[PDB]
Amino acid sequence: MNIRNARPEDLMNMQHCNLLCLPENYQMKYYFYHGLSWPQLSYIAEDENGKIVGYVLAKMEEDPDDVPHGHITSLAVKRSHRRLGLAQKLMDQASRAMIENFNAKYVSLHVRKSNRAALHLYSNTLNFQISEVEPKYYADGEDAYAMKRDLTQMADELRR
C-alpha cells in the first residue's frame, strides 16, 4: 500500500473510510480545517486504484500553558488490510511531521477501553502510555483512555 501525505484532493475519500470503519464521524469542513491548518500532519494509505484503505487525521493541539503537542483526531484502517502495519507506519509518518514543523513534544489520542488490540498496538508497538482515564468519553457512554507518546526519542533520532 502506498503511504503519502494527504492533500485536499484526498479528504472526501478519507471521510468515506471514516464513515465505513469508525462511529466517530465528522463533517467535511472539519477535514478542511485539518488539511488547511496542519497539512504536513495527515497521511493516507492508498490502493493501486487510489482507494484509501487507512488514514490518519492529525492535529496540533493549541495549548499555550505548556509545550506544543500533537493530537490524532482520527485514525482507522480497513479490516481487509490488517497485519500490514499500516496503523504503525501511518502513526510514524504523522508523528515525525509534528516534530519537523511545530517542534512537537508528545502526541495524544483517546481509545475505547474495550478495544484492547488497538490499545495494545499503541501500548507495545508505538510506545503509547496511558496518561488519564476520561470516562464515558464516547456517545456510547464508554470510558476512553487518554494515551500519550513521548516524541523526544524520535526527535533526537533525527537531530543526527
Next chain:
Amino acid sequence: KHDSGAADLERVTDYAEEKEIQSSNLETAMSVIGDRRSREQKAKQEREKELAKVTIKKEDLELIMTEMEISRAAAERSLREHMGNVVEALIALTN
C-alpha cells in the same frame, strides 16, 4: 467529551487583527504594478475593441441560444469570435 470539531471550526471565523509590514522600498515596486496593471487594462481594452466592431444579426442569436441551449452572452461571444458566421460558430459550439 468528543467535540466533533464544532468548537474547533469556530476558530476559523474568530476575530483577528490585520497584520502589517515593515516599510522598505515599497513605492518602487508599487509603481511597477501600475505598469503591469495598465498593460493589462490596455490589452483587455483592445480585445473588446475588435469584438465590438462586428456585425450581429439578431436572428442568429435566438437560433444559437436555442439550438445550443447556451446564454445570450455566450452566444454573442461565439459569434463575434467567428466574425459573424453562424455556421462557423454553431459548428465550434458543437465541438
Next chain:
Amino acid sequence: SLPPKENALFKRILRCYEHKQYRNGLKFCKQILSNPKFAEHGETLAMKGLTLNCLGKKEEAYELVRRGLRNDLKSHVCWHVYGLLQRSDKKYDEAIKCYRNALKWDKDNLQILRDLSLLQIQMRDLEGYRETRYQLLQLRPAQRASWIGYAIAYHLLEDYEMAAKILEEFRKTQQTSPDKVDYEYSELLLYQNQVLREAGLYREALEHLCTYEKQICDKLAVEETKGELLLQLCRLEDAADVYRGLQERNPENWAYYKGLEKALKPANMLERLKIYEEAWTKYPRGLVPRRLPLNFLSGEKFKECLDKFLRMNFSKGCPPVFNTLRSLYKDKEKVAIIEELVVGYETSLKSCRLFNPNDDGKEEPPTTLLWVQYYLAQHYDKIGQPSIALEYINTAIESTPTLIELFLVKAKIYKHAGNIKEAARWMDEAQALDTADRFINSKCAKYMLKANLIKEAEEMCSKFTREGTSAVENLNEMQCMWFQTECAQAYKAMNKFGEALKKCHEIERHFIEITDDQFDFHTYCMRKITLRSYVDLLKLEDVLRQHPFYFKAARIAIEIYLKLHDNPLPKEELIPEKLAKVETPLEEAIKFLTPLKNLVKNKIETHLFAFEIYFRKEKFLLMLQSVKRAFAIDSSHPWLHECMIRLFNTAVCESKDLSDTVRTVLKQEMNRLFGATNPKNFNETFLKRNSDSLPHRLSAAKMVYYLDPSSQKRAIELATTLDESLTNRNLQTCMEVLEALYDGSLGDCKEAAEIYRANCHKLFPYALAFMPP
C-alpha cells in the same frame, strides 16, 4: 448623525458583531432604539437585522434591514449589511450589487472591498477579484493579506511569472522582521517555489530552494521538490542521493522508487530489480519493494520473486494478499504462474506439511494451508470459476468456522456470481462475529441494500448511528454518501423513483455544502499562510463535482428522469412523490448533466446521457455535439452506435422541417464522421467491424429492429450467440440481452427469452436472473 453618547453605542454593536457577541449586540441595539428620537434609524435597524441573521431569526432580519435600508438608502453601511445578509442565503448576484452600491457612498471603504473580493473569489471572477484585491494593495500596502490576495489572483489566472515577483517583494519584508513566525515563513517560500515550478523556471526554483531550504520547517516538501528539480536539470547523482533519503523516511511511498529509477536509469530488469532488492535488505519489514517488481518481472525472474512474497504472507497469514495480486491478473501469462505455484503449495502442505518438500525448513503450521485456501478461493473467483472457488472457501471453513475474512470471500463469490441474496446472507454472519467493527457492518448493509433490502440495511446501520434519530437521517447529517448512492440505486431498481430521486438530490446538497465550505477559509488561510494547500483546495472546489459519488448520483437521476419523461406516472424538504411527478423531468436531468459536461468529459457515459436527453428534446445540434464528443473517445462504443443510428435516421426521416442553418451544420459535420451511408449499411458495417464482441452485437441487433422492425428473427438471432470465442460473453452482457428481450428493445420475444434464460443459466448456475421462474 448620532449623539456621541448614543453613537458610541453603535461602535459597540459592530465589535459585538465582529467578535460574535451577538446577544450583547442586541443589548446596545435596544439602548438606541428605546430612545424614541432614533427608534427607527437606518444603520441601527440594519445592523440589528444582521445581528439577528447570525441567529435563527432570518425572516425578521430581512424586515429590519430592508426597513433600515428604506429609511436610509444612501448609506454604505445599510447597503453593505444587505449584501452580507443576502450572501448568507447565497444570492450572490444581488449581494454583489449591494456591495457596489455601498462603495458609491464610501469611496475607498476597505472592509466593503474585502467582502467583495471574498465573494468574487467564491464566484471565480478572477479578473474582477484581481482589481478588487489591487485596490486593497493600493490602499493599504502595509497589510499582509493585501499582497497575498493579489499574488493569489495572478496564480489563479495562470500568470505564474508575475505572481512570483509579487511574493518576492512581500517576502523581502519577512527576513528583516524579528517577529517572524517560522511555520508561516516556511509555507510562504514553498508556495513561492511552487509558483516558479508551475512557470517552468526550474533552474531558478532550485537556487531559490537551496537558499530558503534552511528556513523551511517542512522537509518532505524540500526533498520531494529537490529530487524533482534535480531530475529536470539532469543531476542524476544528486537526485539518486535525495531519493535514497526519501526512501529512508517513507519506504512505502511508490514515487521514491520511481524517482530512484529515473535517477539511476537502470539498463534492464536485472539492474532495475537491484533498486528494490536493496530496499528489501535495508528495510526488510517493508512490503512495497517485495510487491512492486511483480508488475514488470516476467517468467523466471517473476516466479522467483513471487515465491518469496506469498511464503512471507501465507505464513504471516496476511488477509489482503490477493488484493495486491488483484491488479496483476490482467496478464494471463502471470496467472498460470500463480495458479500453478499455489496449487503446488496446496499439495505439499496437505501431504508433506510444508511449502515445498525439497526446501529444508521447519514444517509450517496448519494456518498456512488455510491462508493458501483463502487465496485459491479469491483466485478461482476472478477467473470466473466460482464453482471450484466455493469448494475451496467451504473446505476452508470446516477447518475454521470463526474466521470473518473467510465469510467476506464467501459473499464476494456469490456477488460475482449472479446470486446477491445468498451473498447478503453471508455478510450477516460476518458482522455477527465482531459486532463492534463498523466496517463489516457497513459492507453487510451495502450487500443488503443491493438485495432490495432497505429496511433490513437501515437496522444494520442503525447500530453505529446516533440513538436520537433515525439511522437514515444520521447518514444525511454526516454526509454518508456510500449509503445515499447504494440505497438510491437500490430504490431505483425497485421502481421507487420517488425515494431514489430523493437521495440523488440529497447528494447534490452535500456537494453544495462542500462547495460553500471554502468561504470561511479565504480570510483564514491568508491569515495562517497555508497558501499552497489553500490553492489546492480552490482548484479542488472547481472540479469538485467530478468525484465518483456525484456521477453515481447523476447517473441514477438522469436515468430515472428519462424513464419518467418517456412514460410519466431549513431549505425545502425534498418530498419523494413531488419529485417524481415533476412537470419538467428532462430540464431537471440537465441540472445533473451540466456538471458532468464541464468536469468529467473524459468519460463517454457523460455525452451518451447528453444524447438521450437532447434526443427527446429534438435539439439536433446538441445530439450532434455530444455524439461528436463520444466519438472522439470511442468511435466503436455500442451505446454510442445506438445514438448515432437514431441521430442519422431521424435527420433523414424528418429533415424537411429543419432550419436551413441546422441542415448546413448538421450535414457537413455529419458527413465528416458519418460519411455518405444509409442507416442500415452503417449499422451492418458496425456489425461487421465488431462481430466478435457481444455488447456490440446486442447494440446492432437493437438497431436492426429500430430500422427494420420486420427483422425481429434476425435481431434475436444476432444477440443470442453464446460462442465462447466471443469477447465479453460475460454475466453482465448476457443479463443485458435477456433484459433487452424482456425490455421489448428487440420486440416481443416471449417464446425466445425462455431459451436464452435457460441457456444462460447453464453458464452462470448461481445467477438469480437466469433461475427458472
